[PDB]
Ligand binder design. Structure first.
Ligand SMILES: Nc1ncnc2c1ncn2[C@@H]1O[C@H](COP(=O)(O)OP(=O)(O)OP(=O)(O)O)[C@@H](O)[C@H]1O
Ligand SMILES: Nc1ncnc2c1ncn2[C@@H]1O[C@H](COP(=O)(O)OP(=O)(O)OP(=O)(O)O)[C@@H](O)[C@H]1O
Ligand SMILES: Nc1ncnc2c1ncn2[C@H]1C[C@H](O)[C@@H](COP(=O)(O)OP(=O)(O)OP(=O)(O)O)O1
Ligand SMILES: Nc1ncnc2c1ncn2[C@H]1C[C@H](O)[C@@H](COP(=O)(O)OP(=O)(O)OP(=O)(O)O)O1
Ligand SMILES: Nc1ncnc2c1ncn2[C@H]1C[C@H](O)[C@@H](COP(=O)(O)OP(=O)(O)OP(=O)(O)O)O1
Ligand SMILES: Nc1ncnc2c1ncn2[C@H]1C[C@H](O)[C@@H](COP(=O)(O)OP(=O)(O)OP(=O)(O)O)O1
Ligand SMILES: [Mg+2]
Ligand SMILES: [Mg+2]
Ligand SMILES: [Mg+2]
Ligand SMILES: [Mg+2]
Lengths: 734, 733
């Protein structure tokens, strides 16, 4: 041994294991069941003569990263702190970060930070904000979290790979930018409170916000909903609108249900329609227009009513079989269903297929007035002049669920629930569609041109509360104030490439805040998914969420004024989510209301809301790993998730596995979806928009190794029974 | 004995004398036709209770099957029999009703435009009815009548009812186009144009024949769109395509300006994903209004050979490869200039650039060839500019290889499209072409679908029937009728896109070609390959262009020249006889027979109503009407067999009885050398381009495979004689 090492400056000195052993001790503080000697054993054997000190540092990182297991979960924090150490050297040349002001100035000169930081904050104000920063909080990240920070969030050079900042400078400047326009009387106060909220992992922020809000970029929109009209001018506008947003890396929600069916006459019969599929293809290439091949890049979800005439051709657009002429595979789909459609299924009757051009007012009423829909639907069924097609409800629903089973990307949206239990008046601004992940339900209006100021493209800013980072529900009051005010300030911060999109964003100021670490949240309270023991807890939890969110936005409307289009909301008429929820929820939950909604109701009727929507439960796979949380409301598939990477295999252990290893309920440890869907329904009672609920099935739990069709339709009807608005993925175990 | 079923529902015993009465009336003046032979094959198919309509359709098909080389006049027998039935379906009798009574009835039904009764009085309709000779319906061939019944004649697409005859079509097309003409000469022009199209002297496009009298105003069938290097332009181009393919029009897309894969955006805020993902977006725009996504409309996308992704764009049509790098449902046209061919002959390399990294290289590539070579070599010597070196021999081989397999990879010599052009390259250069590569018009990219600063090139088509004229001096009258009619259509048709109307109203570009050229050489006893038609072609197409220009020139004296005439070479007194490829002087010694110098001074002073007039387009539909050969292309056989809904339709080449040995079939030709020489001579006078085809027979080559050496031989041969574009490459199987 006694080999030589290579320092950073190029120098060379005899190896000193005491220096390595000294570092490992500083990264193992407070950790349990960790062996420094075991790390050194796996590290020393890899050492060679003339080794770089940087390679030595990465060696003890990977060596500790491989020791991440169920038996010793704290190795994910050991390798993390070791990774933090190296990133300090890469960005600063030392451990302790420079002064906040000295950092910003240097970065602005390089052109990595926005210059408005030095314009909106003085040097003295930067000194005060630096005191808020606790750089020791970087030791609270997990190993999987650091890899996410180093690769996605932290400002860096995409060419050389140099890191230019740490995790704490990220949080303090995101807070600095969002509240930069606040008066100095309260500006620095909000900056501190919001910083401590996101640094202690109480509020989770989306990827484009974490890696953007401090950089010169202003592209923060990642959720786009576009409704397409039945005209070439509208299709061209929709297509152009897609290209503009997928170029900014945004999820697209397309509503092409208005497009008339194949064979439908045009201009009295001067020409005849060629089908929706040729236009669906045009939308797909628009989405894949900025993808290095047409496979990756961006994705979208196209929506259409079940009673559409070509519905038998649209459901089978994703299956691998069939020719390219009748397949549009690289997009997802969401079939829109209402009460009358399910009724025909239960009664085993038929479903009459119409083209939305041959049935006047049938489409609009399909979303707004269900009573008017059933009137028009039955009227046009008995009409022999209207072109139609008869298909049995049992077969149609079976075809839908069949393709949903194989592809797993065919989604369901109960549109009647999206307007009967909605924050919007269906008579003024109805919800006719959703987004990519089916958690967004916002009003839309078709565009006659890409720059049409009469259309409306729905945008929504996302965020999430971390239920695993709060000790009680009364903390949400403070967190809601910080979350809403920050996102609302971002709306006036970001840019809008399409005029019709800015109209909706400035008009309604729609927000969508969800939750993460819900699985771990049930584990702490000793609850589960399937048994239905978390029903009362869920009702208590999401009540506190929605109440404090509304209260935060309501007080914000007193300060800066309500949104311009607030009169188009149900809140303006004094209608709360606790008034229009699915009454079938009363049979699965008896938890009482713990907050004064009636006082809130009068406060909203008088002062209004800053935002038309506030709550929306979205999936979180990237933002969750930062706080070491479970993916949204979904249960973990295992105690330890294994994901390969550029620096080897990354392992992430569920939070507090040492004390809750039996408290957790894995995905495939569940009997069925009945317990899960009931919880979703209870959440939906308070959630303004929708929930990205997933259906799960294990072929091994069913005879002949196949999931029966009777079970699929059962859970589907079960979901609709409890007021579930949307259904996302269908996970099939292999 | 047996009984037949009348139209009214009645029933009468069969009368063979009635059928023999009809057949005799349809065989008048015909030679080598046997009425008894038709009756022999017709009577045996008869059954009791047969409908008279089925009887009529039986004797038609029976006469249609007897169409052969030995007796070519059967094509007129079955035709006249088909005409008879169409008279009954539309009028209920043989003799058509009065013109005025017909129009009024049709307008009431909403099949004709009401502006016919507004622009013409009852007395004027009576005068036009005197011009109509309904006996001319007996001059159509069987293949021609079938085309009338299915494409041209106004009908109900649901019930299948015919609402008019062929003569009402011609007289009302003439009536509408000249409806705005002064009373002094209006009916005078109506008659002359009627006699021109009814005697098959002037051939008109499908959308004109089936449109100009109906309430529709969609007559644009030729669209050229240039795409800029921006999302705003790609979206605009996409929107522009969809609206025009919805009107059934051919699209010419120029997506050469789109920067290559990896090119930096806004200094490097984002990086390009390639041209191919955008090509797919253009394709679905084309196939957006197509039954199933396969039929409907088609387009041709153009890109320069020196483009960086040229190795990826050349192989977009082959059946091989994954879907990620294939765009098969569109045709392509590689743009080549002098420097590219020079690198080929010297066996050197071709440097590939992205049009975003080479300032002014794209513009000079079309406009200034001298400037191009300067910039190309300069940017070649620069090591800071991203580039890629590929051998000229290999690049050309890859191009011709995919052209050989697909037959849809086209070639456009852009240097010839501006050195020998009716447009000033410094003001309005030709940067692209159309679907069939016969159109060469200036274009400007759109920053929006409704951009008033962009320019979408449109062109109205037509053709002279060389087999229907007795001399070349007849073209003087025909050009006057042709140009004035098409120019009037420009103010008649609608424009769904502002940028398209700008080009149409500004330059008023026309494109008149020819049909029956193969039969034209047969009458004069000339051929393609031997080069015996070189001097004849030079004489013919001179008379075409001269009489075309002279017609438009005097039209400019009457109604004023086109607004953007100052951007033409004609304005500076430059004629096609001044800027042609000088290599043509070695293959033709035919002198000019017309006073061009008098025309030259008349153009400098009074100008031209139209910036362009001549363009040789393919004609497969309009040619069958006049029983002509498909454009300038030679026939593949003496009799063409084409299946249909009513059986097998047979068409015999014109005057086969006297010219069976005079003709030169397609596969009876040694090579393309004889053909390309003729095309080169035509290009000397043609304003735009020619849809020239290259033909090859694997049986005439050893090992049953066409050598690459021959493909490059004919390609360089074409460029040598100033051939602007190359269309199909027909490979015999
Ligand atoms: N006070 C500290 N607490 C925790 N980690 C530290 C501290 N100071 C430095 N580090 C980190 O420990 C690693 C080594 O630090 P440092 O350069 O001070 O010591 P060394 O490399 O072991 O020895 P040498 O004096 O030869 O440089 C680096 O990744 C650095 O960021
Ligand atoms: N003078 C004519 N010259 C040529 N064709 C004619 C003439 N008169 C009629 N025809 C056509 O010949 C066909 C038969 O004519 P027509 O109806 O008068 O006689 P028919 O059918 O044999 O007997 P009928 O109708 O009296 O029972 C029709 O298609 C009609 O248009
Ligand atoms: N002489 C040495 N022998 C063995 N390990 C060493 C030696 N010096 C440093 N190390 C260890 C300490 C850390 O775990 C790891 C990385 O040290 P690091 O401080 O980043 O590099 P460095 O010491 O060469 O540069 P610097 O001069 O900036 O401190 O290497
Ligand atoms: N030529 C065409 N071929 C195929 N589909 C077409 C064609 N033209 C339009 N379409 C499609 C696009 C739309 O979905 C629909 C026609 O709608 P639109 O663009 O508004 O036409 P329009 O307004 O002129 O007539 P309409 O009164 O029938 O709506 O049919
Ligand atoms: N009784 C008959 N026996 C045999 N052939 C007949 C008879 N009547 C007519 N034809 C022939 C004449 C034509 O060649 C062919 C089609 O006749 P067509 O004139 O179109 O119908 P039609 O005679 O039944 O009605 P219309 O009274 O309108 O003339 O049938
Ligand atoms: N996000 C994107 N992903 C992929 N391709 C893109 C993206 N944005 C633009 N493109 C394409 C479209 C154009 O061909 C080209 C950029 O041109 P353009 O739309 O005019 O952008 P720009 O004007 O903002 O920047 P530039 O100065 O580089 O042209 O790259
Ligand atoms: Mg060190
Ligand atoms: Mg319309
Ligand atoms: Mg009759
Ligand atoms: Mg640009």
């Amino acid at each position: 041994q006694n080999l030589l090492v290579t320092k950073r400056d190029g120098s060379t000195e005899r190896i000193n294991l005491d220096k390595i052993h000294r570092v490992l001790d500083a990264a193992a503080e407070g950790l349990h069941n960790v062996s420094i000697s075991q790390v050194e054993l796996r590290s020393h054997i890899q050492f060679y003569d003339g080794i770089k000190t940087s390679d030595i540092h990465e060696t003890i990182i990977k060596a500790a990263a491989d020791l991440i297991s169920r038996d010793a979960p704290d190795y994910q924090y050991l390798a993390a702190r070791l990774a933090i150490f190296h990133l300090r050297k890469k960005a600063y040349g030392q451990f302790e970060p420079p002064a906040l002001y000295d950092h910003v100035v240097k970065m602005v000169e390089m052109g990595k930070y926005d210059n408005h930081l030095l314009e909106d904050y003085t040097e003295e104000e930067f000194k005060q904000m630096d005191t808020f920063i606790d750089h020791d909080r970087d030791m609270t990240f997990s190993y999987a979290a650091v890899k996410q920070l180093e690769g996605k969030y932290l400002v860096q050079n995409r060419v050389t790979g140099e890191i230019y900042e740490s995790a704490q400078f990220l949080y303090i400047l995101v807070a600095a930018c969002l509240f930069s326009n606040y008066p100095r009387e309260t500006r620095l106060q909000y900056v501190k409170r919001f910083y401590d909220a996101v640094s202690t992992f109480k509020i989770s922020l989306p990827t484009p916000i974490m890696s953007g809000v401090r950089t010169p970029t202003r592209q923060f929109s990642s959720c786009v909903l576009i409704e397409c009209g039945d005209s070439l001018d509208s299709i061209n506008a929709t297509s152009s609108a897609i290209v503009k947003y997928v170029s900014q890396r945004a999820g697209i929600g397309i509503n092409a249900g208005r497009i008339r069916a194949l064979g439908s006459p045009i201009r009295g019969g001067e020409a005849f329609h060629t089908g929706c599929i040729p236009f669906y293809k045009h939308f797909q290439t628009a989405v894949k227009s900025c993808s290095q091949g047409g496979v990756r890049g961006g994705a979208a979800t196209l929506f259409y009513p079940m009673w559409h005439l070509e519905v038998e051709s649209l459901l089978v657009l994703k299956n691998n079989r069939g020719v390219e002429g009748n397949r549009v595979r690289h997009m997802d789909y969401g079939v829109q269903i209402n009460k009358l459609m399910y009724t025909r299924l239960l009664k085993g009757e038929d479903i009459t297929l119409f083209s939305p051009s041959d049935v006047p007012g049938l489409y609009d009423a399909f979303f707004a007035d269900q009573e008017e829909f059933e009137r028009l639907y039955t009227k046009y069924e008995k009409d022999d002049s209207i072109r139609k097609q008869r298909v049995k409800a049992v077969e149609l629903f079976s075809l839908m669920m069949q393709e949903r089973a194989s592809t797993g990307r065919i989604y369901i949206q109960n549109v009647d629930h999206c307007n009967t239990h909605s924050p919007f008046d269906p008579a003024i601004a109805p919800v006719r569609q959703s987004n990519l992940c089916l958690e967004i339900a916002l009003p839309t209006k078709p565009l006659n041109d890409v720059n049409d100021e009469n259309g409306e493209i729905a945008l929504c800013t996302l965020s999430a509360f971390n239920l695993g980072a709060i000790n009680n529900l009364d903390e949400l009051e403070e967190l809601a104030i910080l979350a809403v005010r920050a996102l609302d300030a971002l709306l006036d911060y970001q840019d809008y490439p399409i005029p019709a999109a800015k109209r909706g964003a400035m008009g309604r100021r729609t927000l969508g805040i969800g939750v993460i670490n819900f699985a771990y949240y049930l584990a702490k309270h000793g609850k589960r998914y399937s048994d239905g023991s978390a029903n009362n807890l869920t009702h208590k939890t999401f009540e506190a969420i929605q109440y404090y969110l509304l209260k935060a936005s309501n007080e914000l409307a007193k300060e800066q004024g309500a949104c311009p289009w607030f009169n188009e909301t149900t809140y303006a008429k004094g209608i709360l989510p606790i008034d229009t929820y699915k009454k079938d929820l009363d049979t699965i939950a008896n938890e009482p209301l713990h907050y004064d909604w009636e006082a809130l109701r009068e406060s909203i009727k008088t002062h209004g809301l800053r935002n038309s929507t506030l709550s929306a439960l979205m999936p979180s796979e990237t933002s969750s790993q930062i706080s070491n949380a479970t993916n949204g409301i979904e249960p973990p598939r295992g105690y330890v998730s294994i994901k390969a990477s550029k620096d080897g295999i990354l392992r992430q252990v569920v939070p507090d596995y040492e004390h809750l290893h039996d408290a957790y309920e894995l995905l495939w440890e569940m009997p069925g979806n009945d317990g899960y869907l009931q919880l979703v329904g209870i959440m939906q009672k308070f959630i303004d928009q929708s929930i990205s609920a997933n259906t799960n099935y294990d072929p091994s739990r069913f005879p002949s190794g196949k999931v029966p069709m009777q079970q699929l339709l059962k859970d589907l009807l079960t979901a609709y029974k409890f007021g579930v608005k949307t259904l996302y993925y269908q996970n099939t175990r292999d």
